[PDB]
């Protein structure tokens, strides 16, 4: 589909890098029992000291170099402590009279490191990688880590290491270089090799979502985003269908169409499908909110105390769903059929836009009274959920930066999950544990349903008084699923890394673990 | 006129119900002197007890049924009081071994009920009608009401009873059931019968206005609204004319055209006319504000300035069209009435007008736009010039103009401004007989200097004076040269916020105003 | 109690008209007698939403039976909360009122549904002069929900008239027809105790600020302890200074009424197997202090609802007298006023556990008083510490006005609170203490910040602050800021009394007996 | 701009002198505020840390 333009300098596609410098890093896992070699690059020891806070660093691994081992003797290393995040660099000559660089990163005093602590360790590692022209990094695991934490280590290292420069012209980092080799020394190395390429797949699925979220609104629009989804499906041999306005009118998607009425780019409904070769025992629909730009629409004279929308990353749900499509299409799980859905549109201000007070008819026949054009996410999700249920699936899971109220409930670290089915909710919480993307279960409080009782339409779009917006929005969405287990993940608080000024790609690993472990 | 759309699902007409269940209710008025018959349905006594606040219930009327007669004995009724709005239901078998339902609604302790009090009585009555599958309701008046208050009772009963379900798809009330018969027992009943069908006419004019106000902005637009006005004129054999953009440009309606510049629907000026057959003794122009949707326009960077939170911006046009129904149905003598509305949309687009624009009205005066969200007075300016060019005796406009009305008179009383005391007093008399409350407010000429533009002839708005209802009145007055004119600001009273529905305010007020010569004629 | 005609005590009504209602539970299988008063059937229709009303019970009156026939009753529907009642003559030519309350189409009513049913009943009770009410249960409710029905009926029926003189009736009998009626009789008097504990808390919360102050509130707590033979101690400023309660003392520095620390104790006669400290926030008036150039907003004024819930729990516990428990009822009561002596933003104060706190907002006074109260609670050597407080307005955006939030450092204790929420039918939802936000409380000059300058998850940050004042004891924190006040009815809910009492009774409810 | 690090001063220690060689220091750049420090033994077998800003 051709992307409309106002000026000839308007771009018509989203630049996407599929082969990243992370993909060019050769990773080798060696067993720690055989001793550690040094030679070129940087060798970093991950050391802890359980119990003793700020205890001394002691190198436990055998090093296959006499000169290096003499520097790492306990007498020399006891001057340093293992405080979480601390790092040091050492310069020395090896047995072949060549200069090598060695160091360590402190891993604290807890024997089993948490995801947040490991994350801080990775950030200290990335700091050592930056502003240094290394060709190889070697990481020696002198701490206890299981298979999942090792995968999380690689995913986080890969993601934080990668720098998005698609939109730098004259300000590209002239000194940035990427290592070409990553060595890992760990006990039972054969048991961790299986996680390396899985981490690489999980990394790019997250970084792919990040590339879409960080794409500016003059590059990303309903036409260009659906084009990228088609490209992705063709690369991975997925079935794809993009529904245009004419078909959406036939399906009577009045809520989704109303939101996009005032845009210069027409609505595009993304429908990707992965189908296993053998018997299908599980059918899953993943629905992502996909507002490429949310102006708020005709909400220019809001009564004071009206719901405010300050979160501008309004297709993070679509990005996470498409990033999950990358992982699923690459890993090719068995016995499952997955539908990747997003009602993509723009929410613009023009003479053609929908208005507050409009009464629109959704694709399930329910009429909706519009109370706020800036509550556009739940309107597009309503028709997407009806479409999902008509596919006849076992589970419907939607993910969306829906309500800013999440910043006041769970904050910037935990996403919230709502749903109509306890078994499905528990599966999301289980996938949250193994994906290491935190999720907390929040209730759909039915006492608030009465605030959506419209005087003229079947239902109100918004509540005029109840401030629990995340719960009210869930109650609205629930009206568009009759009889299918459904869960709703509100990622409005966790989608964007405000400290680093970049997306998190939140939801890719969560949704992939949900698809794979089911 | 064809209604433009963005998508195929965009509606192209306003759904309007003309034949309502209220129209199927057969009404019979009987004299209370002969006693009340009880035979079926629900029979409700309107009882008061003057002076004795919350006094006991005592039925004064004779009942032609032994079983009902002494269920209603004082000994049985003394556990109940007459607090305004309270109600009770009784079940019994009558002398014909049939089950009947009897009850009362308390009417308080003051003999003369106010318009607000009567509304509370009607609402309690409607509560008994709802959630009950009755075929007939009988109301026994053991209170004193004049003919106007009796008519107001019926209008309010009909209006509150009616439920607007035009936009319910999957949530239509399945238990809805309307009575088919209404009996009324009142003293001197023969003098009240003529009020029955007048109340039914006044009811639908009000409900018609309500249907237009409650119509969503994606159904109601300048094209679809003028289409409905044409339909209404054809049903009632009224003359009609709809002015399009080309004719409006020839008339130089620059203020009205500027507001609609950024709209997707073109401006449509509605002009309906009722003319009596006999002598025409009074010519009247009724002007209604008709903004089908008011986005505020390019008011995106207002100074930390007047705020507009009232979103029912064509209630004035709706009241004028509802008045056209009543007048076209009742067909009064000796009058010629013009029903006018400059209908448009106030949208944000590349084509919209801007603050700081200087536009030329149809009387040649240049206006400096200070706030695109003050669009109502701009459209009314050209409509008033159009009205005066018709050569009428009275010009009356009605509009949800200024939110300041909420701070002056509140949600119950509309405000009337004008340049002619005789006309203002006639509006006040119409308020009394229609029972739609209106209060006279002054046009303070000392504030006129705040509209002195440095570059144009006049400012659209004041930059500092907070008495916006008066300033807006001063602005409108600049577009009536030498004709008696009154301005009814209904911004505070148009919408029933507790019930979340329109009031249809102004329909009965304006119709009584039209009938003000017949009401003050020797033949009355 | 100093005066600035200023009242010196909180008026409390102990003997309410509800206590005069005689309650009888009859088994529905024997049929319902109708002879006097108002008889209401609680009916549902699990089939058709808003379906017709159908009365199943047999009535021993021909005229009332003719009214309750299916042909006559289909004119009414079962929409939740809808009701109709009619007055008629029975077989003995006596005036009776018969009707129904719609219970919807879902078989299992929630606490919110039961509230709507009760409100319809109370509306008829307030608008009918009756000597007796009879309620016929043609719906299914368990024993806890039946008790909740009675408690809510009693509480909503009661009208607080302490403060009208010129703007100044109640049934004497309540009949209940229900299946397996013998299993519900024990709930009647428990409901009456739970009702007054809730109404007692309501009387304290609704007490005006010129009646309720730290002196008059602690005086009321002493009266309550004396009435119920509870041990009591009221700590004054001098003792609080000896305990170095610098955070609690700072909040009350600018007040005209001095700080008063309430400490009530219930101790079982037999073996004491569980020790519990219940801590309630008790700010009798919160002006916000020197927060004149404010950013977190604090807009709601029901700042001793936690103390009221704790004292209302003390009534229930002192009345029911459970075994094997020792309960401490604690509240650091104070005012937060503006004067030349008030504490200021930027103050660094030392709490009773030695930790220095940098004050960032004098309007965040609740957590400061709770900090010293929690240190006091832990020094008692208890098994569980549970605090309850209208702490953060952010609760209105997370769980709303119906569900309270519980935070804690011990999953066993949190799960017991959730159990108590289920059996008390006062809804509570578990929320996490996210330790990633702890760094936002790292003060540059003091040991810890009072508030976060940027993190909007205020309910979690406040929990992280409170956690710094419980060293090694199972502790839970119930934020009732959203649920304390019934905004539609313009009155308190008394939220937490029944929840906390069920929590105290959690060893008995999970005992072999 | 952001060019490599080049040490101009002579240091009176042979072991550290080799660390500050151009080949070793060109892996670092002079962006304002950037820094690296390494730990090593000097000519007298004593631990020293040297670095740049
Ligand atoms: Ca490449
Ligand atoms: Ca999103
Ligand atoms: Ca009378
Ligand atoms: Ca209007
Ligand atoms: Ca002039
Ligand atoms: Ca005359
Ligand atoms: Ca009997
Ligand atoms: Ca028991
Ligand atoms: Ca409190
Ligand atoms: Zn947004
Ligand atoms: Zn939005
Ligand atoms: Zn307006
Ligand atoms: Zn306006
Ligand atoms: Zn407060
Ligand atoms: Zn406060």
Author numbering:
A (entry chain B): 86 to 603
B (entry chain C): 86 to 389, 391 to 610
C (entry chain E): 88 to 91, 94 to 257, 262 to 387, 391 to 609
D (entry chain F): 138 to 190
The authors write:
Although overall sequence conservation is low, M17 aminopeptidases possess a conserved homohexameric structure wherein a dimer of trimers encloses an inner cavity harboring the six active sites. The sequence and structure of the proteolytic sites themselves, as well as the reaction they catalyze, are highly conserved, all utilizing two divalent metal ion cofactors to catalyze the removal of select N-terminal amino acids from short peptide chains. PfA-M17 is essential for the blood stage of the parasite life cycle, and inhibition of PfA-M17 results in parasite death both in vitro and in vivo. The crystal structure of both PfA-M17 and Pv-M17 shows the homohexameric arrangement characteristic of M17 aminopeptidase enzymes, with the six active sites orientated inward and accessible to the central cavity.
One structure, solved to 2.0 Å, showed a previously unobserved conformation. Overall, the quaternary structure is similar to previous PfA-M17 structures with the hexamer arranged as a dimer of trimers and the domain arrangement in each unit consistent with previous conformations. However, the new structure shows a vastly different active-site arrangement to any previously published M17 structure. In the new conformation, L13 loops of each of the six chains cross the entrance to the active sites and extend to the active site of the neighboring chain in the trimer. In this new position, the six key Lys386 residues each occupy the active site of the neighboring chain. A relatively large movement of approximately 13 Å is required to elicit the conformational changes in each of the six loops, which also serves to occlude the entrances to the six sites. To obtain the slack within L13 to adopt this extended occluded conformation, the secondary structure at both ends of the loop has been disrupted. Site 1, as expected, appears occupied with a Zn2+ ion in a capped trigonal bipyramidal coordination geometry, but refinement suggests that the position is not fully occupied by a Zn2+ ion (∼0.6–1.0 occupancy). The interesting finding is that the “catalytic” metal in site 2 is absent and further, there is electron density indicative of a metal ion observed in a third, previously uncharacterized site. This position, which we now refer to as site 3, is 3.8 Å from site 1 and coordinated by the side chains of Asp394 and Asp399, the main chain oxygen of Met396, and two ordered water molecules.
